[PDB]
């Protein structure tokens, strides 16, 4: 609690300080982003200095062949006026902002930026080696600038921007142990195939083995040839039009057959991790400040209540690949699958890595 | 309108504070 993060405009007319870079979203109370902008009066002009907080969406357009091109279309923006104190926005600064005036005097004016819930966390989509431009996804940024008024122009030298990531973490208590049963009886034989699956726990931290206990109760004529185990990232993307996707991130195809009319019990352990998923351009990563190697995207925690942004989640799938033929031939699928949902995120660190 | 961007500004640095 003695280190602050500063960033100055290239021309030095605007230096922005911040207390932290990651601002935790407990689903109830979202940590606020608070800081001061130090206006060098030597390099001052009589043009208001504003500070704005933008939640936006960096996408690279698909038709435009050009590399490095990203478009930012914002979702939540806030405009805090801090050029004079003259307007009636008299607000009690924090103990962060209190120490900062003590350091820099009444030339560092404070902004008290407030982040609502029901707004997305910072989530980056993995770029191909094709891509060389800014990181695509959802990212928050605060920029401080100078202009005669808000509808005026903003010169890049008369402005400075810093990107912050809104994060989340594994709650204190865990959820129940996840478990599911989906059970197809088949057309020709009335005796059923009953799939039972469970996970050892509902909350895994990144890079931890998930172990999946599978219980098969085959009472069919049909012979389960293969068992397919997939850990599978679900991603809900809300924008002007809504688009979802289920990608897999750590799987294995086990050739454990189950006979006709035999019980089968085996537990399968699988860790997700980004290395074996590099190829999956567009998979959901966690937030990147500039370019670092972010892990697989943490689940996104939701309250009781077309919710905005990009909503990661996980479910481990358990498919049984079932013998065909006999009556309908190869025309009707016979498989039986089960999805166990679970939350995968980080622990609350009571948070950057060797950089260069 | 809707705005574009290029590749990767300034370097982000840190200063210290009062130990209150």
């Amino acid at each position: 609690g003695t280190r602050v993060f500063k960033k100055a405009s290239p021309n030095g007319k605007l230096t922005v300080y911040l207390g932290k870079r990651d601002f935790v979203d407990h689903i109830d109370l979202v940590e606020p982003v608070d800081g001061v902008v130090l206006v060098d009066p030597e390099y001052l002009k009589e043009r208001r200095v504003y500070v704005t907080l933008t939640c936006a969406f960096r996408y690279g357009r698909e038709d435009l062949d050009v590399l490095g091109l990203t478009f930012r279309k914002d979702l939540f923006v806030a405009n805090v006026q801090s050029f004079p104190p003259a307007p009636e926005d008299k607000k009690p600064l924090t103990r962060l902002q209190e120490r900062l005036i003590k350091k820099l005097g009444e030339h560092a004016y404070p902004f008290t930026f407030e982040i609502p819930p029901n707004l997305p966390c910072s989530v980056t989509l993995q770029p191909g080696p094709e891509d060389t431009g800014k990181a695509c996804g959802v990212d928050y940024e605060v920029k401080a600038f100078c202009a005669e008024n808000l509808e005026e122009k903003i010169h890049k030298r008369n402005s400075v921007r810093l990107v912050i990531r809104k994060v989340q973490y594994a709650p204190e208590r865990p959820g129940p142990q996840p478990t599911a049963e989906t059970t197809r009886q088949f057309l020709m034989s009335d005796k059923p195939l009953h799939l039972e699956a469970s996970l050892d726990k509902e909350i895994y931290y990144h890079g931890e083995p998930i172990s999946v206990n599978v219980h098969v109760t085959n009472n069919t004529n049909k012979t389960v040839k293969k068992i397919k185990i997939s850990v599978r990232q679900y991603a809900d993307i809300c924008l002007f039009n809504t688009a979802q996707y289920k990608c897999p991130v750590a799987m294995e195809e086990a050739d454990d057959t189950v006979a006709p009319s035999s019980t089968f019990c085996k537990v399968y352990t699988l860790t997700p991790f980004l290395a074996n998923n590099r190829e999956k351009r567009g998979l959901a990563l966690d937030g990147k400040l500039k370019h670092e190697d972010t892990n697989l995207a943490s689940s996104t925690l939701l309250r009781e209540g077309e919710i905005l942004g990009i909503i990661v989640s996980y479910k481990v799938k358990v498919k049984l690949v079932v013998s065909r033929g006999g009556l309908l031939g190869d025309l009707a699928s016979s498989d039986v699958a089960v999805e166990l949902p679970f939350t995968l995120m980080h622990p609350k660190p009571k948070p950057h890595v060797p950089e260069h | 309108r809707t705005p574009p961007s290029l590749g990767p500004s300034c370097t982000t640095a840190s200063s210290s504070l009062r130990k209150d």
Epitope: R3, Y205, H206, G207, E208, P209, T271, F273, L274, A275, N276, R278, D293, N295, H346, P349, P351, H352, V353, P354, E355, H356 | A13, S14
Partner: antibody
């Protein structure tokens, strides 16, 4: 909750030696492994690191063309192939976890493996 | 270039119950990514403090440290028999992570 070091020993210079580091007590995927080299009458010197989760390896400049670091995450160990060994290259060699996410210093180590190289 | 970490008390001797400290400087801004390790010879190193101020778990509260720009200090308030060894400062900002040359605490008698 322990790392154990094997394979250290005495090799003729120019030669090679391959060290094993059998981890246990954590998840090789949420940890990342390092090799610290510490001469007897001298200090500490990191040589090699490997995040199986992100897949990258990093090396200390003095051992680029001669040292290889690996990880057999099935059997939850990691290996240091030390090729083309010199006289500077002798030390005790330690294995060392870190947090494979948000590096908070080398927390757990193992007692070491003695690597001797002279003619 | 590489980052040089130098512990300025090459040797030191003191007594049980002192506030003794070790200092370590870095070649350039390591931005409070510094650890501190203890090590009695033969036996392996053990970790004490990470990021210069956060004390590791299972580590006694009498330990702490301080950053003053490039200069990093290790503080120990009322030492015990357990706290007698050589002490090492590490940086881990830049990839070539480095270590101080080694501050050995003696015993005053």
């Amino acid at each position: 909750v322990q790392l154990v070091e094997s394979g250290g020993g005495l090799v003729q210079p120019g030669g090679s030696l391959r060290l094993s580091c059998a981890a246990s007590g954590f998840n090789v995927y949420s940890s990342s492994i390092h090799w610290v080299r510490q001469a007897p009458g001298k200090g500490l010197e990191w040589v090699a690191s490997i995040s199986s989760y992100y897949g990258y390896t990093y090396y200390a400049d003095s051992v680029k063309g001669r040292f290889t670091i690996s990880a057999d995450t099935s059997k939850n160990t990691a290996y240091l192939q030390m090729n083309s060994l010199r006289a500077e290259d002798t030390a005790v060699y330690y294995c060392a976890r870190s947090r494979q996410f948000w590096y908070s210093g080398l927390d757990y180590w193992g007692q070491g493996t003695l690597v001797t190289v002279s003619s | 270039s590489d980052i040089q970490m130098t512990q300025s008390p090459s040797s030191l001797s003191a007594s049980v119950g002192d506030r003794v400290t070790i200092t370590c400087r870095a070649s350039q801004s390591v931005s409070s990514a510094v650890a501190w390790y203890q090590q009695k010879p033969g036996k392996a190193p053990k970790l004490l403090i990470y990021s210069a101020s956060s004390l590791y778990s299972g580590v006694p509260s009498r330990f702490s440290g301080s950053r003053s720009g490039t200069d990093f200090t290790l503080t120990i308030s009322s030492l015990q028999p357990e706290d007698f060894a050589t002490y090492y400062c590490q940086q881990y900002k830049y990839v070539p992570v480095t270590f101080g040359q080694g501050t050995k605490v003696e015993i005053k008698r």
